[PDB]
């Protein structure tokens, strides 16, 4: 508990200075969801969070994002979860340290459409990502893939890909892509336009120390 940076987990404050109360549970929930009108965007930044407490945070957020939608669509506005650098925290085979998250995500991949929650996966090394998640993905978009193993691995997943469409991948130019699935009328090759805006005295310190 004396660990300073982890304090936010144990004892949080509001603006007034009060210890969190149960009433604002929904409030913190609507820190993610927000208003139903004028839909909004949320950006978690995980760099500061320690490495040993990384899986638990994401399992917890998955639980909330799932169950909110469950209860909102029981009696009857979708939400989507974008996981970048997926393979860091969803390995093919790993110990307990990352298992806590494996269980939260996979279940959605089993069934979550009914609620309006849907995933997106980004992986620079698609082979080292686990078995279950991919198979439940309707459409696929692929840019350049130079390494040899991934050629075969990705060729396996989508058999609509002709025998020869695999050779095309290493020759793909800057900003050119292959999309295959249910959405397109015919398998096609395409080009991306650029985005705007683009993404992007020791005594003194020991005094604080």
């Amino acid at each position: 508990l004396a660990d300073p940076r982890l304090q936010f987990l144990f004892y949080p404050k509001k603006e007034d200075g009060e210890d969190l109360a149960t009433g604002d549970f929904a409030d913190v929930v609507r820190q993610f969801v927000g208003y139903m009108t004028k839909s909004n965007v949320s950006i978690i930044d995980l760099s500061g969070i320690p490495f040993e407490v990384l899986s638990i945070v994401v399992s917890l957020i998955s639980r909330m994002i799932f169950d909110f939608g469950f209860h909102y669509s029981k009696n009857r506005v979708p939400i989507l979860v974008v996981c970048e650098e997926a393979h860091n925290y969803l390995p093919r085979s790993g110990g307990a340290a990352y298992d806590a998250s494996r269980k939260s995500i996979e279940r959605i991949a089993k069934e979550g459409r009914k609620y309006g929650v849907t995933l997106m996966v980004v992986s620079q090394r698609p082979s080292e990502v686990s078995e279950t998640i991919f198979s439940q993905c309707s459409n696929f978009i692929s840019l350049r893939l130079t390494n040899a193993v991934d050629q075969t691995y990705v060729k396996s997943l989508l058999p609509d890909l002709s025998a020869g469409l695999g050779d095309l991948l290493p020759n793909l130019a800057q900003g050119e892509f292959l999309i295959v699935g249910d959405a397109p009328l015919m398998p096609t090759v395409g080009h991306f336009a650029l985005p705007v805006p683009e993404p992007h005295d020791f005594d003194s310190v020991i005094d604080r120390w």
Partner: peptide, 8 residues
């Protein structure tokens, strides 16, 4: 439409 972005 609501987006939640995990950003390492």
């Amino acid at each position: 439409s609501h987006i939640v972005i995990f950003d390492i």
